[PDB]
Amino acid sequence: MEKGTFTLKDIYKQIEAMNKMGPVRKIFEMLPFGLGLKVDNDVMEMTQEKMKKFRVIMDSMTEEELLNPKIIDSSRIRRIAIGSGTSPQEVKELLNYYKTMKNLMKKMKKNKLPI
Length: 115
What we know:
Layout: H1 9-15, H2 50-60, H3 63-67, H4 74-84, H5 88-104
């Protein structure tokens, strides 16, 4: 139905906690010219914190889409991944995360007693 018990749009907002977005003035305070294995970030994009790219796709995908995950449109997510900069594969695992939810079935409290 229109409601899917706490849709996933409620999950992406929880990651907003981290972002560090606000380059006002003096982003860094002086730096050593002899950097080592600290990061060495280069022109090639790199990945690390999964939560960092989690929020980005939150404003990409359509809320209507979040309400109905079963509507996985391979074409719609294609363009969307480009907007987020990641890819459909990273969104496929994201849904696969709720697969883990099936693991909940190991506990499946429910009731198991209609009468």
